[PDB]
Amino acid sequence: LPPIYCPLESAIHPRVHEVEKRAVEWIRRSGMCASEEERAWVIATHSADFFARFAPTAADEDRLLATSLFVYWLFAFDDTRPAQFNALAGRVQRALEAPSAEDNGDRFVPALQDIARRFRSFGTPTQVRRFVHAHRAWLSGVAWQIGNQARGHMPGLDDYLAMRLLSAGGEPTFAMLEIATGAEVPDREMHRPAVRALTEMAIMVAALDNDRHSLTDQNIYSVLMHHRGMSLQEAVEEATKLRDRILLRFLELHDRVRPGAGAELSTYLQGLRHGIRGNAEWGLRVDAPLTWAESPSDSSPSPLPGAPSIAWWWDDALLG
Amino acid sequence: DLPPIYCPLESAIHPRVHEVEKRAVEWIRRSGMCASEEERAWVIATHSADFFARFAPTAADEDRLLATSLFVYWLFAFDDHRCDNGPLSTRPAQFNALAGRVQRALEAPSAEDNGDRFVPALQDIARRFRSFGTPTQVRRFVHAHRAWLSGVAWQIGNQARGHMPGLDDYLAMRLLSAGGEPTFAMLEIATGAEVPDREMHRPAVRALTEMAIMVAALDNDRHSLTDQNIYSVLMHHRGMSLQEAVEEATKLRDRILLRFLELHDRVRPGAGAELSTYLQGLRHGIRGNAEWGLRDAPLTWAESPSDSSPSPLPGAPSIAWWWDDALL
């Protein structure tokens, strides 16, 4: 119901329409889609538009295209029993890490191995490893989500946020920023806990803005209605306060970290911000005047009570 | 009828192994990881300090060898109570949630246990790793850890279904499920020798690491001799007798160790000091895994490999890139 708090930079790659054209071509020739109907559904995600908002100045069009292809792949992959899914997650992950892996008629594997080949031609082995690890973390979150559903386990807030941090696909999406820009972030800066907390907070906000398409009954609203005995409206109210409070922490930690940051880490952080805005904006649009909340619905500087898995995001002692 | 192991690698053990084992035994008693005295004695009897003292035998800091040794105890204990034997060993849906809760606890110190006695123990190990490892080395460990849990989740999925994976899926799965990724990723932590990203992530070093892990895994399948292991896989998929499968298994394991030795000899000369140390660790680890498996008494080793082919293994495309030098 209420308008989104997002005081972050909005921009989109100027060559977005050219990337999109090539991406529609790759989707058609990729084998990942059985019928015309399924290819139109994938094309209709507008994933080139989505990702062009994450890396709006990427110098290499090919880089943007490759990264964009994976966002199309991820929406096509998302669209299985836990036991089979755990095997499928293992095979798909192996194919990403081993080019000699063979498809065995699985329609997703050749397409991901084509994305991986492209990533290997542009990115350092280091950047490829970051993407590989982010990819496994997303697959873990999806395995967790499919598990809860098969059992009829509605997770509490803490488990839901931990799981949705992985299952929403934000880890692999944000790990593509460097591959798209070419700006290699040194280990010493990338793995600073402060930078990990910023990455996870960007991911968590994009995930909660995606949930907002209550229009998978494992979502923040279901979780709060089931565990707090709230109505839908009391839960939309409570979800917005949680989310706004996370993005308020992100802006605060970002302003403490940005000043000292080198060129490559600065580009990456601008990416986090472009991606949070891009994610909210793309969700609302998929050129109408959009209204944005000028102010957060909850301004508390404190950790979320009930969510101890994310409280370290607020512990400055632990982030230095 | 069990042929001796081909392992012409350096066997060595930390001179302070007994001092570290004593501290390890006391941590175990205080950890809360063990419900009963029978469990404490089971975990102590793994001799995991002996095990990892063979992986990092010149570790300058005893506290680093202790912390990495604790995770080896933890791993045996978590494998035996939550992965291999209890209600979760055929309940992938419940395991996927545990894998998620444990992995999150490793990455987030503010995480709460929720009635899990394995979690506070892991968090203590994690606190140790963050006290003296770099954030980079901690992330290398965290990522290796999730990789191992994904293998176990795959394995448990296969078990619930009574699905016997083919050779390709079994080697892919077992590369993860046998716990070699997070075991080998603790070398740097024990040792203190931080390997730069550009060296660590080199396809050649990744392949040497996978090969080290795959030999240790198949040495572990041998040590344990329906069940998903190399022997049941070859018996089911090639219609072999146990005896033919034991011989086929030794052959393919020996082929992988030969490629590892061959790639090692090409990479080692140019390696800087930290990558050299890491490499030595892979070698010490393969041998130490095999040797700890067979235990005072004289051990017999095979002098020659049972198969000397220099090409990729038939029926396992997922590992063929270990032999592709243009890619490495």
Author numbering:
A (entry chain B): 8 to 86, 96 to 231, 240 to 310, 325 to 358
B (entry chain A): 7 to 231, 240 to 309, 325 to 357
Task: Provide text from the study.
The variants could be grouped into four categories based on their substrate preference in a Malachite Green assay: promiscuous (I), inactive (II), diterpene-specific (III), or sesquiterpene-specific (IV). One representative variant of each group was subjected to crystal structure analysis, and Cα rmsd values in the range of 0.35–0.68 Å compared to the parental SvS-A2 structure indicated that none of the variants had significant conformational rearrangements. The Gly83Leu substitution may shield off not only Phe79, but also Phe82 and Phe84 from the substrate, which are putatively relevant for cation stabilization. Since our modeling data suggest that Phe84, which is conserved in bacterial sesquiterpene cyclases, is involved in stabilizing cations for both the sesquiterpene and diterpene reactions, sterically blocking this residue by the Gly83Leu exchange results in a near inactive protein.
Spiroviolene synthase (SvS) from Streptomyces violens was first described by Rabe et al. and represents a bacterial class I diterpene cyclase that we were not able to produce in sufficient quantities for crystallization due to protein instability.
